[PDB]
Write a protein that binds this ligand. Structure first.
Ligand SMILES: Cn1cc(-c2cccc(CNC(=O)c3cc(Br)ccc3O)c2)cn1
Ligand SMILES: [Zn+2]
Length: 352
């Protein structure tokens, strides 16, 4: 019962891997921004999260949409959790580079994005290469969106980097011990964490774990040799892709109505990792069973909607589906749309 899903996955692979000029234009724009931000007072230590990560695609069906993160190290941060939210923080700290954005003791996000935008917006017109336009949008995080020629779109996010221990709200998160092992959990928690602005009180930051995500997905098996042959070839990644593509196509289909705007691939990745924890054996992700495995994910995700519970994978107490974050009517609307796709072997896939 995998025939149609395979074809979808094959189609999606061929537009990933198709020779494109997009990545090359993105790199020239980002490198110019970085060299101009580096010789500025507040952004001296700015750098790319990964080198060779100019081509990060949040939208797995939109290959001209890139999402790039610019990191910045903040030594000796003092975090203060906002209003018991477990996940949103004030940043405090004595003539650090970021002192020009203080508000008493508290790091201002909107001020830092103000100058970040203005610095970039200044270097954008200084670009003599190609057609680069930026655009003020109310999202605000993804902060600065650039458009390169017509099709290519780049979202640039600014993150603070901390090489200290992860904040306490994550202590019981990342419950990978029965799947990736307790020792990998240690190694991962020894990596730095990142803060991005919220998009409430205005100057809060939340944690970003996109780098931990990338790391799990590139080494995702209980078996160390998972996906290194076709001997133990598994379908975890393919299931994540179909979850992502399912929500994207639904968001696209119902973009006129307003009900799916609060959902993102972040809700889908989060539910997916919970199912990995629930099903830690590679045998439970055999590629022969692509159709069943996908169904597990779809089923679990729909359970989350109906109960209004989807705990953050890194922060156990933070409920992404709390009605204060996404109300009952929206979750009930997504629920019924997916139940319909599923009960009809997903017609949103045979259409592009
Ligand atoms: C798009 N969007 C995200 C948040 C958000 C809010 C509050 C706290 C967090 C913590 N991050 C994660 O759970 C996370 C999980 C995975 Br899988 C990969 C990366 C991640 O950053 C995120 C809000 N909108
Ligand atoms: Zn695998």
């Amino acid at each position: 019962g995998a025939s149609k899903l395979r074809a979808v996955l094959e189609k999606l692979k061929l537009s990933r891997d198709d020779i494109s000029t997009a990545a090359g234009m993105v790199k020239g724009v980002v490198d110019h921004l970085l060299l101009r931000l580096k010789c500025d007072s507040a952004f001296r230590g700015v750098g790319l999260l990964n080198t060779g990560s100019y081509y990060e695609h949040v939208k797995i069906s939109a290959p001209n949409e890139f999402d790039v993160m610019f990191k910045l190290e903040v030594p000796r941060i003092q975090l203060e959790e906002y209003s018991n939210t477990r996940a949103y923080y004030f940043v405090k700290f004595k003539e650090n580079p970021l002192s020009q954005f203080l508000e008493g003791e508290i790091l201002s996000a909107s001020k830092m994005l103000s100058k970040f935008r203005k610095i970039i917006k200044e270097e954008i017109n200084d670009i003599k290469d190609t057609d680069v336009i930026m655009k003020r949008k109310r999202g605000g995080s993804p902060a600065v969106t650039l458009l390169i020629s017509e099709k290519i779109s780049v979202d640039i996010t600014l993150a603070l980097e901390s090489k200290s221990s992860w904040p306490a709200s994550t202590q019981e998160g990342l419950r990978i011990q029965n799947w990736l092992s307790a020792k990998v959990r240690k190694q991962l928690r020894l990596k730095p964490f990142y803060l991005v602005p919220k998009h409430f009180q205005e100057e809060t930051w939340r944690l970003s774990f996109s780098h931990i995500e990338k790391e799990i997905l590139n080494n995702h098996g209980k078996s160390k040799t998972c996906c290194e042959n076709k001997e133990e070839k598994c379908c975890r990644k393919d299931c994540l892709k179909l979850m992502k593509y399912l929500l994207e196509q639904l968001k696209e289909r119902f973009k006129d109505k307003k009900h799916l705007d609060k959902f993102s691939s972040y809700h889908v990745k989060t539910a997916f990792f919970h199912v990995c924890t629930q099903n830690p054996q590679d045998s439970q992700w055999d590629r022969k069973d692509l159709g069943l495995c996908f169904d597990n994910c779809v089923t679990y995700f729909l359970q989350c909607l109906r109960t209004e519970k989807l705990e953050n994978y890194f922060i156990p107490e933070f409920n992404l589906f709390s009605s204060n974050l996404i109300d009952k009517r929206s979750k009930e609307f997504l629920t019924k749309q997916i139940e319909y796709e599923r009960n009809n072997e997903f017609p949103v896939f045979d259409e592009f």
